[PDB]
Amino acid sequence: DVNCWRVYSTGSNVFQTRAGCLIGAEHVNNSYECDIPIGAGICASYQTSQSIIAYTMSLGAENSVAYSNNSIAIPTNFTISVTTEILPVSMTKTSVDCTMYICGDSTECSNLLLQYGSFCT
Amino acid sequence: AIPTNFTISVTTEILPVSMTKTSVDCTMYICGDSTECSNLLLQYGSFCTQLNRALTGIAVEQDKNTQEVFAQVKQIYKTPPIKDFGGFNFSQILPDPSKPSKRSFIEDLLFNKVTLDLICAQKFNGLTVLPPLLTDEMIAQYTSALLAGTITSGWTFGAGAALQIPFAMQMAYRFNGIGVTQNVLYENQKLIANQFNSAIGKIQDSLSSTASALGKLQDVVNQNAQALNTLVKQLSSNFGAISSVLNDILSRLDPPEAEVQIDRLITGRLQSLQTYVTQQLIRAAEIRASANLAATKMSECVLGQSKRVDFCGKGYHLMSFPQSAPHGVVFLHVTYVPAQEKNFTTAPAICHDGKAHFPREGVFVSNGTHWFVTQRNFYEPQIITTDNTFVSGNCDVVIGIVNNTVYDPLQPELD
Amino acid sequence: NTLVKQLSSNFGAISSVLNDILSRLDPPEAEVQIDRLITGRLQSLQTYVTQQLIRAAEIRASANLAATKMSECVLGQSKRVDFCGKGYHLMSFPQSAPHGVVFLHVTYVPAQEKNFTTAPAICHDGKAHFPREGVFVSNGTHWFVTQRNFYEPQIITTDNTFVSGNCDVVIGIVNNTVYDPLQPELD
Numbered sequence: 001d002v003n004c005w006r007v008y009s010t011g012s013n014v015f016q017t018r019a020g021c022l023i024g025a026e027h028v029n030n031s032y033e034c035d036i037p038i039g040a041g042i043c044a045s046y047q048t049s050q051s052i053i054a055y056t057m058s059l060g061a062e063n064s065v066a067y068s069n070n071s072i073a074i075p076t077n078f079t080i081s082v083t084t085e086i087l088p089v090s091m092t093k094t095s096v097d098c099t100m101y102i103c104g105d106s107t108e109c110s111n112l113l114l115q116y117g118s119f120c121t
Numbered sequence: 122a123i124p125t126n127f128t129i130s131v132t133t134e135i136l137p138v139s140m141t142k143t144s145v146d147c148t149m150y151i152c153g154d155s156t157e158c159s160n161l162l163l164q165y166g167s168f169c170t171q172l173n174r175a176l177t178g179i180a181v182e183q184d185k186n187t188q189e190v191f192a193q194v195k196q197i198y199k200t201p202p203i204k205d206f207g208g209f210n211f212s213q214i215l216p217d218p219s220k221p222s223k224r225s226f227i228e229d230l231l232f233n234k235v236t237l238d239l240i241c242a243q244k245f246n247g248l249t250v251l252p253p254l255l256t257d258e259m260i261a262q263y264t265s266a267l268l269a270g271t272i273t274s275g276w277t278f279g280a281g282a283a284l285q286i287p288f289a290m291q292m293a294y295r296f297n298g299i300g301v302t303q304n305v306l307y308e309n310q311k312l313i314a315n316q317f318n319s320a321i322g323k324i325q326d327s328l329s330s331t332a333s334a335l336g337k338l339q340d341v342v343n344q345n346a347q348a349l350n351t352l353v354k355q356l357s358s359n360f361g362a363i364s365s366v367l368n369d370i371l372s373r374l375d376p377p378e379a380e381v382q383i384d385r386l387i388t389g390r391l392q393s394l395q396t397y398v399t400q401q402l403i404r405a406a407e408i409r410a411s412a413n414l415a416a417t418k419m420s421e422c423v424l425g426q427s428k429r430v431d432f433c434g435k436g437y438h439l440m441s442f443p444q445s446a447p448h449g450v451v452f453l454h455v456t457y458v459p460a461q462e463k464n465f466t467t468a469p470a471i472c473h474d475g476k477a478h479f480p481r482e483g484v485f486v487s488n489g490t491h492w493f494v495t496q497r498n499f500y501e502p503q504i505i506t507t508d509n510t511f512v513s514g515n516c517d518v519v520i521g522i523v524n525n526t527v528y529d530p531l532q533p534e535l536d
Numbered sequence: 537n538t539l540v541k542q543l544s545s546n547f548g549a550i551s552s553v554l555n556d557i558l559s560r561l562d563p564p565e566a567e568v569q570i571d572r573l574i575t576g577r578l579q580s581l582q583t584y585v586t587q588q589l590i591r592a593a594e595i596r597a598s599a600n601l602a603a604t605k606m607s608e609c610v611l612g613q614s615k616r617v618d619f620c621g622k623g624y625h626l627m628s629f630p631q632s633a634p635h636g637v638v639f640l641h642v643t644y645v646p647a648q649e650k651n652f653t654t655a656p657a658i659c660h661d662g663k664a665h666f667p668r669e670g671v672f673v674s675n676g677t678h679w680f681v682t683q684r685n686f687y688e689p690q691i692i693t694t695d696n697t698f699v700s701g702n703c704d705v706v707i708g709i710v711n712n713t714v715y716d717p718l719q720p721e722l723d
C-alpha cells in the first residue's frame with residue numbers, strides 16, 4: 001500500500017501498480033497466461049539476459065463462431081478421453097491427554113488444575 | 122386435464138461467491154510502535170503466527186472461489202455483429218460497447234443498487250484490504266463470453282469445440298427435451314419471442330424500482346464491515362489496566378511496575394483478536410459452501426439443460442443467462458409454464474378386435490363424442506391409427522378399457 | 537508440532553520447565569507461576585481443538601461429495617454436465633489413495649466438424665414434414681436427415697419424418713421431395 005520516494009531504497013525499473021509498488025521487474029506490453037499472481041489483474045513471470053517481467057494477464061484466445069441463420073456444424077469423428085479426479089475422504093485420528101500435556105508427572109499441578117471445572121473432559 | 126396455451130417466464134436468482142480479503146497485523150495491532158510490548162508478546166509463544174496464517178488462508182480461498190465460478194470457458198467467444206436470432210432481443214444482457222467498462226444494462230443496474238472515514242481509522246491501526254485478483258472489468262468478460270457462446274452454439278461449447286446452430290432450432294431442441302414436439306415452436310414462434318422480450322423487460326423495471334432483491338448480497342458486506350467495528354472498539358478498553366493507551370502507561374511508570382499493566386492489556390487484546398479470527402474462519406466456510414453451489418448451478422443450468430425439478434427455477438427449464446454483481450452472480454432462468462386448461466375423459470386402452478391398443482407416446486382423450494390421442498404437455502388431438510398405437514394382449518385384463526375403432530391407414534391405399 | 541512447541545514458552549512465568557519453578561521457590565510464591573503456566577497451556581490446547589473442529593467439517597464436505605460421485609458416476613451413467621468429467625459421460629472407475637479416492641472418468645468428445653446448410657422443415661405437397669429425431673442438412677445440392685452427434689447421411693422417407701400442418705407458418709422452410717417407400721413396392 002505505498003504509492004510510487006516513500007520507499008527507502010530505489011533501483012532500476014521502478015514500477016507502480018494498482019496493487020502497490022513493484023521494484024526489480026521490467027514492464028512489458030504483451031499478455032500471457034497468469035504464472036505468479038500479484039493483484040488487480042497483474043501477473044509476473046521469469047523469462048528471456050533472463051529477467052522477471054510483469055504484465056496484465058490475458059483471459060485466453062478470442063474466436064468468433066461463424067454464426068448464420070441457416071448454417072449448422074455437424075461432427076463426423078470422435079475421441080475417447082480419460083481424466084482423473086482426486087478427492088480427500090478422511091484425515092488422521094488424534095487424541096490427547098489433558099492432564100499429561102499441561103502438567104505431566106507433577107501431583108501438585110493436578111490439584112491446582114482441578115479448580116477449573118470440566119475443560120479437560 | 123390438458124393444457125392448451127403456455128407461457129415463457131424469466132426469474133432471477135442471487136448468489137454470493139466471495140467476500141473481502143483482509144489481513145491484520147498481530148504485533149502492530151496489539152502493541153503499536155513500542156518495543157517493551159514487543160518483548161512481552163515474544164514471551165508469549167507463537168500466537169501471532171497462527172493468526173497471520175489463518176487470515177492468509179482465507180484470503181487465498183477467496184480468490185479460488187471466483188476462479189472456479191466464472192473461469193469455465195477456455196476460449197473467449199464473440200457474438201457476430203449482425204443480430205438475427207429469429208426475433209429474440211438480447212440487447213439488454215449483451216455487452217454495451219459504448220461505456221469504457223464493457224458491462225450490459227442489467228449489470229449496471231445491479232452495480233448501482235449495491236452500496237459497498239470508517240476505512241481510514243482501520244487503515245491507520247494495522248488493518249489493510251488486499252485487492253481482488255480479477256478486476257470486475259475482467260469478470261464482465263468471462264460472463265460475456267459465456268453468454269455469447271450459449272446463444273450461438275448451445276450446450277456444445279462446454280463439451281468440446283463450439284458448433285454453430287440457428288437459435289430457432291436450438292429452441293426446438295430445448296422444447297424436444299422437456300416433452301413437447303418440435304412443431305409447437307415453429308407454428309407459434311412469433312408468439313414466443315413476444316413473450317420472451319416482455320419477460321426480460323419486466324426484470325430491469327423490477328431492479329430500478331424501490332425493491333429489496335439484493336439483500337442476500339448486501340448482508341455479507343454488512344456483516345464483514347460490522348465485525349471490524351467491534352474489533353476496533355475492543356482496542357479502547359481498560360481490561361483492568363489504569364488506562365487504555367499504552368503510551369501513557371509507558372510515560373508515567375517505570376518498567377518493573379508497568380510490566381504488569383502491559384501484561385493485563387495484552388491478555389485482552391490477544392483474545393479480542395482471536396475471537397475475530399474464529400468468526401472469520403466460520404464465515405469463510407459458509408461463503409465457500411455457497412460458492413460451490415454457484416459453480417454447480419453455473420455448469421449445469423447454463424452449459425446444458427437441467428432435468429432436476431426446481432433446481433434452475435420454477436417450471437420446466439429451457440436455458441439460463443449469467444450476470445455479474447459485486448461479490449456475487451445473478452442467474453436469469455427462462456422457463457415454460459402451461460397456462461389454459463380443459464377437462465377430458467380418458468381411458469387406458471382401446472379394444473378394437475379383442476386386442477388392447479396402448480398409446481406409443483401420448484394419452485387417450487375424448488371431447489364427449491369422439492376419441493383422440495394427444496401429447497401429454499399440450500393439446501393437439503390426432504386420429505387413432507395402427508401407426509400410432511401398439512397392441513399387447515387382449516381386452517380382458519385392463520381395468521378400464523373402452524370401445525372404439527382404429528383407422529388402420531394401410532388398408533385404404535390398396536383399394 | 538506447534539502444539540508441542542507451545543510447551544517451550546514461559547507465558548510470563550519465571551521458567552518454562554514446571555519442575556524448575558518448584559525446585560527453587562516456596563509453595564505460595566510458585567503457586568502463581570504454576571497458575572500462569574496452566575492457563576497458557578490450556579489456551580494453547582483449546583486453540584488446537586477448535587482448529588480441528590473446523591477442519592473436520594471442511595473434510596466431511598468433501599467426503600459427502602465423494603460418496604455422491606461414487607453413487608452416480610460409477611454405479612450408473614450421469615447426465616449432469618461437467619460432473620463426471622469434461623465431455624459426455626460414459627463410465628468411471630474408482631481407485632484408492634492414502635486418505636482419499638481417485639476417479640478415472642471415460643468421456644466422449646466430438647473431433648472433426650463440418651459446415652452444412654440447413655432447414656427447419658421440408659414441405660412436399662402442402663404438408664410440412666419435420667424430422668422425427670434428427671436434423672435436415674445438405675451438401676449444396678441434395679437434402680438428407682442425420683443424427684445430431686455424428687454425421688450419417690440418410691435419405692428422407694415418410695417413415696423418417698412426421699407431418700403437421702401446411703408450410704405457411706414455418707419461417708425458413710424449403711422445397712424438396714419425400715421418398716414415400718410404399719409406392720414403388722406397391723407396383
Ligand SMILES: *[C@@H]1O[C@H](CO)[C@@H](O[C@@H]2O[C@H](CO)[C@@H](O)[C@H](O)[C@H]2NC(C)=O)[C@H](O)[C@H]1NC(C)=O
Nearest residue numbers: 001002003004005006015016017018019020021
Ligand atoms: C503518488 O503521489 C505523487 C505525489 O503527489 C503523485 O504524483 C503527482 O501526480 C500529479 C498528476 O500527474 C502531478 O500533477 C503532480 O506533479 C505529481 N506530484 C509529484 C510530486 O510528482 C501521484 O499521482 C500519486 N500516485 C497515485 C497512484 O496516487
Ligand SMILES: *[C@@H]1O[C@H](CO)[C@@H](O[C@@H]2O[C@H](CO)[C@@H](O)[C@H](O)[C@H]2NC(C)=O)[C@H](O)[C@H]1NC(C)=O
Nearest residue numbers: 075076077078079080645646647648649686687
Ligand atoms: C477418426 O480419427 C481417427 C484418429 O485416430 C482416425 O484413425 C486414424 O486413421 C489413420 C488413417 O487410416 C491412421 O493412420 C491412424 O493410425 C488412425 N488412428 C488410430 C488411433 O487408429 C480415423 O480414421 C478417423 N475417422 C475417419 C472416418 O477417418
Ligand SMILES: *[C@@H]1O[C@H](CO)[C@@H](O[C@@H]2O[C@H](CO)[C@@H](O)[C@H](O)[C@H]2NC(C)=O)[C@H](O)[C@H]1NC(C)=O
Nearest residue numbers: 125126127128309311312313314315316460461
Ligand atoms: C395462446 O397464446 C396466447 C396466450 O396469451 C393467446 O394470444 C393472445 O390472445 C389474445 C386474445 O385474443 C389477443 O388479444 C392477443 O393479442 C394474443 N397475443 C398475445 C401476445 O397476447 C392465444 O389466443 C392463445 N390461444 C388460445 C387458443 O387460447
Ligand SMILES: *[C@@H]1O[C@H](CO)[C@@H](O[C@@H]2O[C@H](CO)[C@@H](O)[C@H](O)[C@H]2NC(C)=O)[C@H](O)[C@H]1NC(C)=O
Nearest residue numbers: 204205206208209210211212213226318321322
Ligand atoms: C430490442 O430492445 C431495444 C431496447 O428496448 C430496442 O431499442 C430501442 O429502439 C427504439 C427504436 O428507435 C429506440 O427509440 C429506443 O431508444 C431503443 N431502446 C434503447 C434502450 O436504446 C430495440 O428496438 C429492440 N429490438 C431489436 C431488434 O433490437
Ligand SMILES: *[C@@H]1O[C@H](CO)[C@@H](O[C@@H]2O[C@H](CO)[C@@H](O)[C@H](O)[C@H]2NC(C)=O)[C@H](O)[C@H]1NC(C)=O
Nearest residue numbers: 465486487488489490491492493502503504505
Ligand atoms: C368433438 O370433436 C369432434 C371432432 O371430430 C366434433 O365432431 C365434428 O363436428 C363438426 C360439426 O359439424 C363436423 O363438421 C365434423 O365433421 C366432426 N368431426 C368428425 C365427425 O370427425 C364434435 O362435434 C365435438 N363435440 C363437441 C361436443 O364439441
Ligand SMILES: *[C@@H]1O[C@H](CO)[C@@H](O[C@@H]2O[C@H](CO)[C@@H](O)[C@H](O)[C@H]2NC(C)=O)[C@H](O)[C@H]1NC(C)=O
Nearest residue numbers: 471472473474475476516517522523524525526
Ligand atoms: C366392446 O366390444 C366388445 C366386442 O365387440 C364387446 O364384447 C361383446 O359384447 C356383446 C354385446 O352384448 C356381448 O354379447 C358379448 O358377449 C361380448 N363379448 C364377446 C363378443 O366376446 C363389449 O361388450 C363392448 N363393450 C361395451 C359394449 O361396453
Ligand SMILES: *[C@@H]1O[C@H](CO)[C@@H](O[C@@H]2O[C@H](CO)[C@@H](O)[C@H](O)[C@H]2NC(C)=O)[C@H](O)[C@H]1NC(C)=O
Nearest residue numbers: 673674675676677678679680688689690691692
Ligand atoms: C452431395 O451428396 C450427393 C450424395 O452423395 C452427391 O451425389 C452423388 O454424386 C456422385 C458423384 O457425382 C454420384 O456418383 C452419385 O450417383 C450421386 N448420388 C446422388 C443420390 O445424387 C453429390 O455429388 C454431392 N454434392 C457435391 C457438390 O459433392
Ligand SMILES: *[C@@H]1O[C@H](CO)[C@@H](O[C@@H]2O[C@H](CO)[C@@H](O)[C@H](O)[C@H]2NC(C)=O)[C@H](O)[C@H]1NC(C)=O
Nearest residue numbers: 658659660661662703707708709710711712713
Ligand atoms: C416452394 O414450392 C412452391 C410450389 O412449387 C412454390 O410456390 C410457387 O411460387 C411461385 C413464385 O411466386 C408462384 O408463381 C407459384 O404459383 C407457387 N405455387 C406453385 C408453383 O404451385 C414456392 O415459391 C417454393 N419456395 C421456394 C422455392 O423457396
Ligand SMILES: *[C@@H]1O[C@H](CO)[C@@H](O)[C@H](O)[C@H]1NC(C)=O
Nearest residue numbers: 013026027028029030053054
Ligand atoms: C507500450 O505501449 C505504449 C503505447 O500504448 C508505449 O507508450 C510504451 O512505450 C510501450 N512499452 C514498451 C515497453 O514498449
Ligand SMILES: *[C@@H]1O[C@H](CO)[C@@H](O)[C@H](O)[C@H]1NC(C)=O
Nearest residue numbers: 122123124461462463464465
Ligand atoms: C373440470 O370439472 C370440474 C367439475 O366441476 C371443475 O371443477 C373443474 O374446474 C374443471 N376443470 C377445468 C380445467 O375447468
Ligand SMILES: *[C@@H]1O[C@H](CO)[C@@H](O)[C@H](O)[C@H]1NC(C)=O
Nearest residue numbers: 066067073648649650651652
Ligand atoms: C465453416 O465456415 C466458416 C465461415 O466461412 C469457416 O471459417 C470455417 O473454416 C468453416 N469450417 C471448416 C471446417 O472449414
Ligand SMILES: *[C@@H]1O[C@H](CO)[C@@H](O)[C@H](O)[C@H]1NC(C)=O
Nearest residue numbers: 068069070203205707708709
Ligand atoms: C437469414 O437471414 C437473411 C438476411 O440476412 C435472410 O435473407 C434469409 O431469408 C434468412 N434465412 C431464412 C431461412 O429465412
